[model samples]
Target: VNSFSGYLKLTDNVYIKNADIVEEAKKVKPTVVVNAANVYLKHGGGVAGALNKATNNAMQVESDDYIATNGPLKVGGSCVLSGHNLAKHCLHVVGPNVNKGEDIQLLKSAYENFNQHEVLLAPLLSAGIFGADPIHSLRVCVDTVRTNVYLAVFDKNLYDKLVSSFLE
Candidate 1:
């Protein structure tokens, strides 16, 4: 449960972790965790859901306060706050809406616009709800960040699949 994690080298200091997204976070203890979320601040679902639960919904309270930032939660936009539960800090990114036929650019927003950190935790955003491509999404992350990055995966099968296709 705790001893589960693999690496996907992206650059000098960037890599993805094929491990339980939520559970493994407590183990890796990254400097920050950027979660995929909608504009509603529904910190009760997906990666944001788990992270919110872990922090006892602390981030959501702050998230809700920023609802007036922009409509439809524009691309490359994010809300940073003190990380709860596992990560020391967090950013709630309103990723691309795959259901609406949106492009993958929004996924890069979290990385492209944020305070720098040594380690960052992220998810296979848009893959589940947004229906975005994992590989393409990863490339955006790689192209954006300068420090360490972890594409934290929760699903064992998906995690393993990514490893087979990218970890070569």
Candidate 2:
């Protein structure tokens, strides 16, 4: 079950049964790529899910090492709470939140710059921060962008299925 718009480049089968971004990334491919804001969201669920996902486990901690803001950098640390140095190589960039017009441009830039064939995963929030429905989010995420931008918009049933199929 997938919905899309605009000129999109899909290399192979991509499933977007949402769960923890890290978990989803691990299941599909090793070289999982993400932007900076979503990285913050996954670290502590962002502003929307912050209150719920927050605890000692919440909040991504800054690391002692310095990462280059612009370049193909390798993140060196655990998958969470370690700046851009997550378990996978995270490409940090300055981009607008979801619904903001800048997102499309930012995604285009990232895709062209990276030039890798791995899966590019992002959250619905990449379009805008508030009041975005799943279909609208999918449209923005799928249509404007070129390349495989896997938008994580799963309901509880799909989440459960992904967990059962991949995590179990």
RMSD after Cα superposition, model 1: 3.4
Candidate 1 has a TM-score of: 0.81
Off by over 4 Å in 2: 1-14, 26-29, 35-44, 47-87, 93-117, 127-131, 157-168
Backbone Cα, N, C clashes tallied per candidate: 1, 8
Model 2 C-alpha lDDT versus the unseen true structure: 0.38
Instruction: Encode model 2's per-residue lDDT on 39-150: one tens digit a residue.
Output: 2334334422331232233223331122223222322111222212222454333334435434443443433423343445555433335333434434444444455656
lDDT of 1 at 38: 78
Look at candidate 2 and give me any clashing residue pairs: 5-143, 78-87, 79-87, 98-126, 98-127, 98-128, 99-127, 99-128
Give the worst 10-residue stretch by lDDT in candidate 1.
1-10
- Candidate 1, residue 146: Cα displacement in angstroms equals 2.5
Please give the lDDT score at residue 138 for candidate 2.
45
- The most accurate candidate by lDDT is 1
Worst 10 residues of 2 by lDDT: 74-83
